[PDB]
TrEMBL record, chain A:
Free-text domain note: The CD4-binding region is targeted by the antibody b12.
Disulfide bonds: 22-42, 22-146, 87-104, 94-95, 117-146, 127-138, 195-206, 195-253, 195-306, 206-260, 206-279, 253-306, 260-279
Record localization: Host cell membrane; Host endosome membrane; Virion membrane
Shown residues in whole-protein numbering: 32 to 499 of 860
Record protein name field: Envelope glycoprotein gp160
Record organism: Human immunodeficiency virus type 1
TrEMBL record, chain I:
Record-given protein name: Envelope glycoprotein gp160
Glycan attachment residues as annotated in the record: 55, 93, 130, 158, 172, 185, 191, 210, 226-227, 234, 257, 263, 301, 305
Entry comment on modification after translation: Highly glycosylated by host. The high number of glycan on the protein is reffered to as 'glycan shield' because it contributes to hide protein sequence from adaptive immune system.
Organism phylogeny: Viruses, Riboviria, Pararnavirae, Artverviricota, Revtraviricetes
Highest taxon in the source lineage: Viruses
Location in the cell: Host cell membrane; Host endosome membrane; Virion membrane
SUBUNIT field: The mature envelope protein (Env) consists of a homotrimer of non-covalently associated gp120-gp41 heterodimers. The resulting complex protrudes from the virus surface as a spike. There seems to be as few as 10 spikes on the average virion. Surface protein gp120 interacts with host CD4, CCR5 and CXCR4. Gp120 also interacts with the C-type lectins CD209/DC-SIGN and CLEC4M/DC-SIGNR (collectively referred to as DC-SIGN(R)). Gp120 and gp41 interact with GalCer.
Function in brief: Envelope glycoprotein gp160: Oligomerizes in the host endoplasmic reticulum into predominantly trimers. In a second time, gp160 transits in the host Golgi, where glycosylation is completed. The precursor is then proteolytically cleaved in the trans-Golgi and thereby activated by cellular furin or furin-like proteases to produce gp120 and gp41. Transmembrane protein gp41: Acts as a class I viral fusion protein. Under the current model, the protein has at least 3 conformational states: pre-fusion native state, pre-hairpin intermediate state, and post-fusion hairpin state. During fusion of viral and target intracellular membranes, the coiled coil regions (heptad repeats) assume a trimer-of-hairpins structure, positioning the fusion peptide in close proximity to the C-terminal region of the ectodomain. The formation of this structure appears to drive apposition and subsequent fusion of viral and target cell membranes.
Region of interest called CD4-binding loop, as start-end residue ranges on this chain: 235-245
Location of this fragment in the whole protein: 33 to 496 of 860
Length: 358, 27, 109, 126, 129, 123, 128, 363, 353, 27, 129, 27, 106
């Protein structure tokens, strides 16, 4: 009495994974070493986007298991390894090293945004919630073909040139009470930073405004009080030791590799006008794409300037007072900080149900 | 990451070593 | 191939006077050149580097200049001990292939 | 392109199945729709991703050709709904179950069903 | 400000090889590059090749490739040169040379080319007497 | 796609017959690239301008078929005149004029009249 | 997919038919340099003239079968009777020793007369 | 008993409007202004052009309400505004006047125009009118199709078209309605009356048009006028009626200057039932045609500058009379200089979906 | 038994197209081949892709291919736009466009024929292709294999060697009136040079010619019963072009008479040849003769290995003779593209049940 | 267009004016 | 040609502004461009700015931008001036200067740069007293 | 091929003529 | 920038007069020398660097091009003891700048 019927165009979807194509608006007439790579391996942006809000629906995202992060962390490794040619590059395989030597000119280097679209027959979901603690169902989703730009930047111990939340400082972590997994603060406003080299020796002073740092650092220590015993006075401390890379705030700017001794930023203790930092410009670094050491040419003549917004940071506990010590080092988990609100699914518009027919 | 080698230097300071990036960092 | 040529081949000038030297390059060596002073059976000495600077422990009567493919050095007041050989070598190309000059003879008149 | 019709199909989830079907019938129809040198390498990489959706579309209109009914959206055939496939009172299905979770119910039988739906075709004319 | 006592005089045979020493002493070692240059009688100096200390990545001249090798050891602070397949014509006076390269150990390097500090040369001869 | 028009100007009956039938220098390396893509952008559009139609016809009952007929009565208001001088001495170009401001009406009926065979088949 | 479309010959109608049935659904089967901006493109145009040139072919068939009553269906048979004067073979062994590999050579010149007849014969349901 | 059906494939057009695209053969190494703009926002021409005739297909063209015109009258503006940078670009809004003024670096440049081809995008056609007697409005009994149009030259002038593409049979007269005293006549020539004018090696020049041709080519056209008037009422050609300086003259561009040839000597003839010269003065204060305003360019270049191009059109105007008639020249609305080159074209869209009533019943 | 209709049976219909080049040209040098091949063809296809087959008996025929003429028109253009003779005498009244007839560089290149949108190409990968007959193993491919345009007579040069033996390819066999084609397995370097009068010495590696035609006697005596000893005879006679080996090399036209290569009969250090240049050559491109410019001044050297010959028997009754000949231009590729065939996919066939 | 000003000057000479191009002509 | 007559000498205090007049008579007014130039005693001349009378577009020196205006009036054949943000140094003499430009009333304009016809001078004093 | 003249030439060597492509061959 | 030579020339009567004013770069043909005896209104003598003003004695004539120019008088006169200034008007937008002048005395 009941017979199978079939419908085409039924709203179903399932999780999957594919290879996205990076899409961004390049120029192809410049020579900067970002627009070139962007115009040779991307697609002109979608002029008018597409968005559809859903209702009475929940889905469980998970920021520490995504796949998009891996494709991004491979694609920009390609970008780098094509862009910045080191004058001598070293790498063990192990240990049997293997040097190399090619051309080593000077180049411009300012990153641009890069979207991430999904091929025909798939979709990308979002979480418009503003309380997302990283995991668990998000009761406010919305579909989209592809996302907002993501300026791919590298820097340790302080995320820079990133995006930020809009209600309160949030604190996301893999598994608190494990002491060996980084966390990810995120400010509601940019504590700006003037950081530059004058016209004598290779040395840069990194100006950051006070009374906007401590004002934007009070919010943080309050948020830590909630997820903890709201007692056991906490403090901010220096680095702990190891390689030079992790014990500072290193990054690139205009083509050089700054190393600012941010020892005078994490020293306050919280019971219930300007600041400067002594940066250097090193010339033999430790690569992050692989294991090994690079080496570049001496710095350029003129003045070098670049300003950014500190929009987040990485910490680490210490297994009571429980002071915190900015560490980090690894570069994979500073893209989770702007890619947690996305998950890619697969459409399956074909279903069946029982009814009464011929 | 070089873990074994990463241990060797933090030991000269009195701390253990732990991998965290082609990047060595002390405990 | 970058090549350096000596000019003049020899300079025999009297004391108390001024003597000048030149070195000719094949192509652009922008700002990479040095001048060495070779004594009889002694290790040479560094005098100029970067074509416009002076080393430590140098009498100011040495000075060099020029760019493009020609660089010139002059000595304004010879001394009875400043008679020796002089060379010019550039270090501009990378990977490292550093050519070396041929020299110049100098003696009392 | 044609790639928007899929998001169109998916837009109306989380609802009751009857409204889903009606919205299907209407919306599938209502959803009809060096400068000039650098439109010589950005043509191909933008003309593959449009003749790759047309393909994946036809790779579906093929299946409905096999099962008797092609061209129609609300199709129904003559295979008896065996009760061993998670039976339930009919109105306990078309009134209180979103499509998604309903997929979970039989997401293991969709190959048993797909199989039988073929022989019922060549056994309809003879 | 390091003093580089080169090796003593030597007399060898055709086709052989040789290993020359240059003892550096006076300051920290790995802040210094090094270079070996040679001179034939009456003829100018001849740049042979360069070695970097903090990376141990040497190079060599085109027309002297293959039969020469430079090597240093950071424990004994000596720069060993080796030259293969000698002859009776190529024997000449070789020179040890160095230069200060910057605060190396903390990841800084200036990468200069010229040669400031010199030894006293070496005597290398191939004969039949 | 533009040569389909070859029969335009012939009358109605000949048009029916023929539609059934038709159913049955270093610049010379550039110049043959930016005028090759300007073709594919035409075909890959003709295909999609087609998949829409054969789907639309999949609503008024008849998809796939070329000459589909149905069961809707033809109102008087739509220029009722002698049938003989309609299929003999008129070219489509002229006919499309005289029926222009009614097309959207007829495109409504052909859905309603289809809804009969939708629900009334399993009655 | 035409390796499979033509790689089931020899064997009787059963094998090839029951393979192509599921094969219908089984149809499922960079250092970018500024130099080759006139090598890859003029080569890329070719494939993009291949893929599209098949989608055109396909749709040009499914329209042809559509005029013989049955469209989309792989192995269809409709409401028209077929003659007996068509080189009448045995009415029993027509499915074991009478096959395409013996048909094709016999009918290599009989295609157009067959493809003609059948579409002409459909018009019985077209009068009404 | 008459039921409706639905065919699929009927040939039907519905006129539409879109954004066409250039087709111009530049050089990419020359550095005049035309040959450097046309190589920025246009594309090389069509290697193997395809054309197709039609048969027994009448069609209703119309010249005075076309919609390709604007699509050219904007491209030309965007060509000039990137080409001839003035030194003072006075632009009154005044909608007392707040007349702003922008000043720039205004250098001297080369200026000669190359032919531009408009093509149709992916999904529309273009219908020529291969007849030879199209007055301007009405059916064209012969129609073809084509992708790209013939070679148009972005020329600008007044009271006399320059480098005008010619007709074949006669010297026709295309008017908006006619007998309305307020619309511009447009003419054409079966033969080019070559014109020579230059400044030799004092900012003035002489314009010379071969005599005894103008007299014989004002004899052809004078006939077709009386084809619309009763074989009487003698017609002639008078001086300008007067107005702004640009109208009561023949102005154009040539090599980088703005000549003004006083053409009062060519229209003094009156018709009952070996050289000539014009005093061409250069100016430096013009009322730009792109909008309302004025400009002020540099003073002219040193050497000799020359320009020769065949005249292939006029623009006239009547006088409200009752007799007799007079045709004082004029013009100025720079749209007219393309309605004399895009007068035989149309852009349409094809729509294959036809209905019809016949005798069927579908079960 | 009634008639059904299917969709997808893999079935061919051997047919013909108008294919397209793939010429690895260079476009900045100024010779003739390497400028025709960059203005009227395309560069090589970077990563060509291939598919194998099974159980697929395919019946070729080498005197009935039609990938031929496509070469026989690309090459006539290659000749017409390259070596423009001074007095291009064409008997229709021999009118002639006499052009600026200057000296121009010359060397040929490898060309590749590929198949357009909607066809294939099917090899015959066996090494026993007797010329026809059911070839039981075939590939599929887009483009042809490596091929160079040698144009000559009596001696076919610069061709890929065969592998196993010297197989012989006849119309059918034993009509005494068909240009037999033959193919070595072995290379013999050739070298004729002009020292520093319109004459030159054409010269062979001698004493190698000896052990390479000692190879062939086996294979003739494979088609023939080992008895009644056979030998090679001279070119019997006709035109001078026929009884010669003529070609172009360095831009000028050699005529080397190699009679010194046939003096033997097979029981059970070089030779100089009257290798005379000319200015009066009978054209192959069509019927006629052309008139060129006076020969060049200096030194020009030729090295061009022969890897294929042409014989022919004699109508007598005994003994048998094999004199060089051939000449018909088309033969130069029927020995180079004999194993290739362009068929067209077509997936629709009916089968009664 | 400036049509008013057109009518001023053309009237100052004894003729009517009418817009005809960012251009001013007195009829 | 023209006959320029500058206004009378002026005496002012800081903070205020200044205004003068150079009645140009003897020709058509709109046919000449004008430039105001000043000099402090014992110093050199100082070009300030030019004004085209027919286009009513002026220009100004890089070191007076925004604090000084020029203006004329073809209804009365007079040329004005006004400098703002007075200082004490402005005590100096100011000169009226013009030049011919051709029959610009029909749109020919040479756009000269120099000055051919002058006034007599105008001294101004700006201080406490 | 010119077969007639080819034939006309070869017989004078005692031989028949035939075409070899565009060339004359004597038999 | 206008560099003159000399600052103030002193020459006896009956002799010639040759002043010099030099600029930074290409001022091709826009130079103007002005005469003023103190207590007067200055006067135009040279414009275009190669032409003579109206009502001027023919001994008044300069020369030069590029960036080098010299006013040349071959005979001093009773009324040739005054100030002499050079001015350029080449660049656009108009930014005209004088030099420093030169005096002539006995
Ligand atoms: C900081 O963020 C603001 C937006 O909130 C942006 O406008 C500004 O440019 C950013 N500054 C830097 C230096 O990144
Ligand atoms: C052109 O011909 C049409 C049709 O006869 C007519 O209506 C129109 O008025 C004519 N126009 C002119 C300018 O004669
Ligand atoms: C041709 O020349 C090459 C090199 O000049 C030589 O090795 C070879 O033996 C020569 N061959 C003949 C047949 O003379």
């Amino acid at each position: 009495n009941l017979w199978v019927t079939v419908y085409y165009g039924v709203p179903v979807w399932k999780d999957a994974e594919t290879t996205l194509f990076c899409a961004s608006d390049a120029k192809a007439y410049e020579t900067e070493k970002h627009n070139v790579w962007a115009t040779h391996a991307c697609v002109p942006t979608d002029p008018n986007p597409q968005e559809i809000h859903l209702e009475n629906v929940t889905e469980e995202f998970n920021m520490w298991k995504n796949n998009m992060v891996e494709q991004m962390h491979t694609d920009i490794i390609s970008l780098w390894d094509q862009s910045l040619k080191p004058c001598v590059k070293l790498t063990p395989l192990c240990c049997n090293t293997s040097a190399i030597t090619q051309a080593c000119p000077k180049v411009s280097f300012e990153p641009i945004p890069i979207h991430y679209c999904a091929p025909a027959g798939f979709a990308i979901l979002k979480c418009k919630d503003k309380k997302f603690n990283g995991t668990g169902p998000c009761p406010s989703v919305s579909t989209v073909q592809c996302t907002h730009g993501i300026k791919p930047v590298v820097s340790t111990q302080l995320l820079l040139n990133g995006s930020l939340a809009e209600e309160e400082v949030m604190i996301r972590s893999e598994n608190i009470t494990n002491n060996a997994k980084n966390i990810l603060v995120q400010f509601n406003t940019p504590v700006q930073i003037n950081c530059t080299r004058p016209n004598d020796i290779r040395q840069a002073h990194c100006n950051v405004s006070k009374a906007t740092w401590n004002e934007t650092l009070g919010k943080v220590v309050k948020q830590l009080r909630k997820h903890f015993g709201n007692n056991t006075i906490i403090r901010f401390a220096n680095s702990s030791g190891g390689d030079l890379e992790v014990t500072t705030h290193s990054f690139n700017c205009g083509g050089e590799f700054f190393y600012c001794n941010t020892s005078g930023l994490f020293n306050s203790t919280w019971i219930s006008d300007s600041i400067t930092l002594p940066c250097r410009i090193k010339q033999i670094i430790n690569m992050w794409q692989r294991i090994g050491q690079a080496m570049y040419a001496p710095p350029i003549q003129g003045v070098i300037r670049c300003v950014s917004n500190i929009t987040g940071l990485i910490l680490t506990r210490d297994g009571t007072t429980e002071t915190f010590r900015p560490g980090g080092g690894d570069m994979r988990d500073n893209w989770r900080s702007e890619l947690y609100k996305y998950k890619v699914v697969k459409i399956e518009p074909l279903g069946v149900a029982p009814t009464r027919c011929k | 990451x070089n873990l074994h080698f990463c241990q060797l230097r933090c030991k000269s300071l009195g701390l253990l070593g732990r991998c965290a990036x082609t990047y060595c960092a002390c405990v | 191939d970058i090549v350096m040529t000596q000019s003049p081949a020899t300079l025999s000038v009297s004391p108390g006077e001024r003597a000048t030297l030149s070195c000719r390059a094949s192509e652009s060596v922008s700002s990479d050149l040095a001048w060495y002073q070779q004594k009889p059976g002694q290790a040479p000495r560094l005098l100029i580097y970067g074509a416009s600077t002076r080393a430590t422990g140098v009498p100011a009567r040495f000075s060099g200049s020029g760019s493009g493919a020609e660089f010139t050095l002059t000595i304004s007041s010879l001394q009875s001990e400043d008679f020796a050989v002089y060379y010019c070598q550039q270090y501009n190309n990378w990977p490292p292939r550093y050519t070396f000059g041929q020299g110049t003879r100098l003696e009392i008149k | 392109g044609i790639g928007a019709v899929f998001l169109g199909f998916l837009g109306a989830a989380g609802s009751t199945m009857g409204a889903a079907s009606m919205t299907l019938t209407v919306q599938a129809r209502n959803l009809l729709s060096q400068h000039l040198l650098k439109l010589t390498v950005w043509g191909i990489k933008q003309l593959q991703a449009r003749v790759l959706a047309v393909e994946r579309y036809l790779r579906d209109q093929q299946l409905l050709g096999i099962w008797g009914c092609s061209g129609k959206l609300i199709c129904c055939t003559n295979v008896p709904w065996n009760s061993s496939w998670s039976n339930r009172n009919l109105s306990e299905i078309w009134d209180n179950m979103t499509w998604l979770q309903w997929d979970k119910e039989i997401s293991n039988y969709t190959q048993i069903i797909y199989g039988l739906l073929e022989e019922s075709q060549n056994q309809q004319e003879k | 400000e390091v003093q580089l006592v080169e090796s003593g005089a030597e007399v060898k045979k055709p086709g052989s090889s040789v290993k020359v020493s240059c003892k550096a002493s006076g300051d920290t070692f790995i802040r210094y590059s090094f270079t070996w240059v040679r001179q034939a009688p009456g003829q100018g100096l001849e740049w042979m090749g360069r070695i970097i200390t903090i990376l141990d990545v040497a190079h060599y001249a085109p027309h002297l490739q293959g039969r020469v090798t430079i090597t240093a050891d950071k424990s004994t602070s000596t720069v060993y040169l080796e030259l293969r397949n000698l002859r009776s014509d190529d024997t000449a006076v070789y020179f040890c040379a160095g230069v200060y390269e910057g605060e190396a150990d903390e990841g800084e390097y200036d990468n200069n080319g010229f040669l400031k500090h010199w030894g006293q040369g070496t005597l290398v001869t191939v004969s039949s007497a």
